[PDB]
Symmetry: D2
Subunit: 389 residues, 4 copies
């Protein structure tokens, strides 16, 4: 159980780049980071419009003199103060993640970087080498992985409760972009611009979420080959896809399927992962994150509930209220952010034992997300043929 | 509404080949055929064990002298009687469908043939030419197509309620063969024998069901290309697949996906079809056949119910009881079988107007089912590459 | 499993009174009765309009000379023929059930009587004495009790799987009469006329269905006291109720609740029964009759599926197709009607051993349904006070 | 939308009484209060064990010298400091709510009081008079009322979308106390002690939650009469009930039903409210708080989703993330707590216009909760008879 007791001596001194007044994702970063004394928001470069960034920073309780016009000034000016930031969350559009993360790491700061890490695998490999050389934590906000029942699924699979794993069926298929909403909505507009978004739309934007859930649940699984067929149903998005099918062969013969979509008309979110074994399946759906289907062949189907005593102990650690009270995605994000804070603090203290026991989406998860999108785009561009992973 | 009033002057004089005492499917054929004065069971070759076939025929109320040891004797002996059969249902294992259907057609009998029609497209084309030359009806028991809400979905799509069709997502993924049950179960045993079952297991056995539903809903849709990746997770079934992924490109750019499986551990049936348009999606699930999800992007999701006045008139014709009372797969099969009887009777009477207005799974549907399986096996055998359809 | 093999040597020679061309319930009687060689429809008094009754009888394949204008002529004329009826189903409006059932019993016929048996407990007691004196079977069409999982629930309760029973929560709450549809619909019109319907509307029409399910599941349970508060929300129905709450105390301290409604706007049927024990609950919903919720406190909830090997053997006897294929209310009614036929045939043969092992809704169930409605009306009329049962 | 911008100039200086290290509810108070700069936790009397209260306060970041041994010392010592508390949340067991709230109000502090306000209506009336005389805000943590779709339901009802309201069906029926867990669990133990808990267990503990939801949705509705039948199924709890049925007549003829239970074996929470009108019903379930069923008679059922543009504007104000991302009970509590802070700040500033537009569970809601429990206990003690409300 969590009761708000501190996990580190003092909150990590913290800034955001992006996540400004009109952003989609800025708020959940702060909601999760400020919770339970993990981080303190003392500075930021909140907006591309520096005037609006400072107006908003002040409404967030930030010193107007620590609302900087850009990330370079933020890092340089904060470095001069003994109470300067120790960590920065990057919530800008995708095109700036590489440059901002690189600069933060070279400035000796820990980073939480919005997915994706960057556009290309070569950039991802460079970022990872710079993070490791500078001994910095890089969290990546695969936020759904914060839900307790993802750890339950991992533990059940590891204990052989599904038998031998045969298939991993993943989807993130919503309908919000069935129409060309780019015309009116700035957040969608930049996501269908290859200059600002990169080589893919839905593969990178939504496909990588349930992919990361499969990596938490099946940590030893390795993709041998994949093929990807992708479409721009809203023709103006071409070459960026608003729908894709990724079929994968894992080492050992298991199969993987990822359906990525922003044109699944009527779907509110539709992020699901079903892991199918020789004995049993489990299935999780992000819109109802407090339940996990557990279906042993030839037995009654079961539903596992967040907070119940029959769960693996790893799956009960982060309960903030008793079973039957619904937790949501803010709890999942809070569960990642306190781990980010413990990892950053542990790094500063040289607490190697604590570091090694902490599990969170990190630089390595970020690299794999970029690798997968790049291989999918390579297959799709060659007309949906099998490629070596 | 249906109230049991006759649709033809007299029940079609009818026989079964197969569907004996220990069969899985024999009973639903009779339940549907005998309902509402459609067919009268007057003869049969019910079993590979002729003694057990006659024992069972007598318990079905059939004259023991009209319980014949084989289909050839059935057709020859019945031809001698003025009250001889006019039609025969073929519910034998897959390997005998071609020979029995061919003999029945050449004997001037109407046929209801269990899916699949036969193993090869060349056999299917031959059967169809013989059915047409002899002016015989061949029904095919794509039984799920008898559910009223399949016609509702067809009518909604035709009226543009989904907008332009983008994707057709189909699955028939159950878990009953997660373990090697072939060891104890004769019905599964013959299905994993290529000599008796043919070139595929789950593609032919279950994949063709939701494929046929898509052909009812999207009658003008044409597959341009497909690829199929198939697996034998129970290794002893090789080369017959217990799992398969079929990805299809339709003419006009829409995509199709079929997941066929007998190893989806914990799944009771899992036959679903989701049609996704630019405006809205619909989705139907065979285990809850009296509801149809209708999901307009940006509006509340809706559930359409069997028997309600807001349905298209085609979708209300076959209601046997008021909305809210659950109908099941026996009603769906009864809805096909009365149409089979009307078509057979209309053929005898030369009632061309009635024939042209009747919609049922016919010889042409049977040919397409065989074509699709054959193309999938061709792609799968070449390592899951795109093939022209 | 059922495979259509005869259960009695010859079909019971059978008539209907009512169930004519425009009736709601006539068809499901015939669908269930004619199935599997149980009954043969050889005569009827189908309609209050004798011309329309004969037109319809002929379309049902009945000899026009055995389409009689009334039940008295039916019984008198059939008595003269060696192939005369042996049994009659009564599907007339409620007001005529007593007179028609009494006449059939005095004529030495077995009866299947539509619920309710009659208006008053004194009439019910008289009917029962006449049925017993004449050694006749009286089936009552509590059709939902034919669903296999009702027997599963009975068996689980009897084996202590719920622990000590604490509460029985019952509802049959649909919305079809939220508006005054009596204006246009003859079936609703007679149900809100006390002269033709009797002392209650929804208590008798729908409340008695889940009440009977509780009597199957908890056969030793006895109601000690009840109170009933009833409303006419469509004011013109007064004094007949379109909504009611019945609260009951059982002997031993368990509580019962029945919500009866025709004004639950938006509800398609809403017949549910939840039995709550010290250890676990089970819950069944008529619109999804092939599943049974089984919820052990402190364990994952389970869903039990029709046709699965983990069910009690009593619950597998009536399976007509494999698990995962949806059966519906026609199967439930067919399961009662073959038992009615076996009981009638067993009575004629003096097969006391078979009779004693048969379980079906009978004269005694019919009497209890009338008793419960009468006590509820007595409480409601006294302003919803506790009455001795 | 909420983006974390301040709603008042400075966070309310805040304390808790109770909500200590081992409490069930202490954490959600702090999670909601500290969010978005609403309150600052600067002091507390956290625990009956003052040593453990101070240990925990320090882990919450509170000055050890402002971790006081009791509420009287907290109020007296804080009054001496210019940075003293302005408001206090009371999260002690029920028996101390009256004395602590009274003392806080007399000390000129705003209060958030855990439900229930107190044991007796006479105490409730006294507390309310003292709150009003001292011009203090008293929030009451009917936390479920913070869910956006409760406001959607209120707005739909007010706009006549349900037609005339006929029934209000409420339940809070969980199974966690099916067994005598009081033996091992201190939180359950005090709830079944009349000295510490008061005159009821489940009526007060859970029944009052969906009752308050009905008061938000139907603000002009007035209970004319009610009856209550209550049971102690775990006999040792007598006279405190672990199950109850409350039937109510509203002025104007609508009916209300509340099922309160801690012995609904297998239920994870089971808090539901269904409002049934002449035209349509709506239904909300606390375990899936982001959906609202909307069921127009004779139309397809609909599901309304949190965050969608078709919602009433009142129902979109508190969205913290886009539609399809699940919010939970922490958001609901955060939505109450920021309103509590705005009301307290508005009271200090004399901003009468802002005060009058704020809607939150207040002193008046607290009084009604106590009134309802007291009337239910009065009816139950007289053997479940109608009492004037
Ligand atoms: N579940 C998730 O983890 C999740 C969900 C949504 C968004 N995201 C990711 O978060 C990032 C932002 O997404 P969004 O939807 O919030 O975008 P958005 O367009 O809604 O917000 C962008 C914000 O960054 C600011 N900004 C832009 N350029 C800047 C610069 N150079 N310096 C400082 N501020 C700058 C803008 O003013 C704005 O406040 C993307 O990488 C996106 O993929 C992740
Ligand atoms: N939904 C559907 O349409 C559906 C479902 C299941 C089965 N089927 C099809 O029905 C056919 C039979 O399937 P099943 O599962 O009932 O098989 P099964 O093995 O359970 O039954 C085979 C039956 O045919 C009899 N038989 C075998 N060879 C015969 C012969 N030469 N002459 C006469 N009788 C013979 C057997 O004795 C037995 O009664 C197959 O083609 C299968 O694919 C269709
Ligand atoms: N689940 C169930 O068991 C269920 C469901 C619905 C109906 N019912 C019961 O079935 C009975 C009929 O209900 P319904 O909804 O079908 O009614 P309905 O009004 O739809 O049908 C009445 C039928 O009886 C005929 N009829 C009327 N009076 C007659 C007479 N004196 N002699 C011969 N025929 C006569 C009418 O012409 C018509 O065909 C009622 O008792 C009703 O409660 C039971
Ligand atoms: N949804 C809701 O609003 C909700 C849910 C649960 C609890 N509650 C209410 O919250 C209150 C507490 O419930 P709980 O389940 O957390 O109880 P609990 O027994 O779990 O916690 C009681 C806490 O108060 C402390 N305490 C006890 N007496 C004290 C005193 N005199 N001074 C200071 N601290 C003291 C204890 O040490 C402990 O920390 C009750 O009134 C309960 O009804 C409301």
């Amino acid at each position: 159980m969590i009761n708000g007791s501190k996990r580190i001596a003092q909150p990590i001194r913290w800034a955001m780049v992006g996540g400004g007044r009109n952003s989609q994702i800025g708020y959940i970063h702060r909601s999760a980071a400020l919770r339970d004394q993990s981080f303190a928001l003392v500075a930021g470069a909140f907006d591309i419009d520096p005037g609006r960034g400072r107006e908003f920073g002040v409404q967030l309780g930030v010193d107007p003199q620590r609302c900087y016009p850009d990330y370079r000034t933020l890092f340089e000016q904060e470095a001069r103060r003994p109470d300067g930031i120790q960590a920065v969350s990057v919530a800008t559009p995708n095109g700036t993640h590489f440059a901002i993360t690189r600069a933060a790491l070279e400035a000796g700061l820990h980073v939480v970087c919005e997915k994706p890490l960057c556009f290309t695998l070569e950039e991802a490999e460079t970022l990872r080498e710079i993070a490791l050389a500078n001994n910095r934590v890089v969290g990546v906000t695969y936020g759904y992985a914060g839900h307790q029942l993802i750890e339950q699924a991992r533990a059940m699979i590891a204990d052989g409760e599904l038998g031998e794993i045969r298939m991993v069926h993943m989807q993130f298929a919503h309908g919000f972009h069935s129409a060309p909403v780019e015309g009116q909505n700035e957040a969608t507009k930049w996501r269908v611009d290859p200059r600002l978004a990169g080589p893919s739309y839905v593969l990178g934007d939504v496909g990588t979420h349930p992919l990361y859930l499969s990596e938490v649940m099946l940590p030893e699984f390795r993709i041998k080959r994949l093929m990807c067929s992708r479409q721009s149903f809203v023709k103006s998005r071409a070459p960026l896809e608003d729908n894709a099918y990724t079929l994968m062969e894992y080492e050992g013969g298991a199969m993987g399927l990822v359906w990525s979509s922003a044109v699944n008309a009527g779907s509110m979110h539709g992020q699901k992962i079903r892991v199918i074994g020789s004995r049993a399946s489990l299935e999780w759906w992000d819109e109802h994150p407090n339940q996990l289907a557990f279906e042993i062949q030839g037995q009654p189907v079961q539903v596992l509930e967040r907070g119940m005593g029959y769960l693996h102990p790893g799956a009960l650690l982060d309960d903030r209220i008793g079973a039957g009270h619904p937790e949501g995605l803010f709890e999942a994000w809070s569960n990642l952010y306190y781990r980010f804070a413990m990892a950053m603090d542990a790094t500063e203290r040289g607490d190697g034992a604590l570091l090694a026991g902490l599990r969170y989406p990190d630089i390595h998860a970020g690299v794999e997300g970029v690798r997968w999108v790049e291989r999918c785009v390579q297959s799709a561009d060659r007309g949906g043929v099998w490629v070596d992973y």
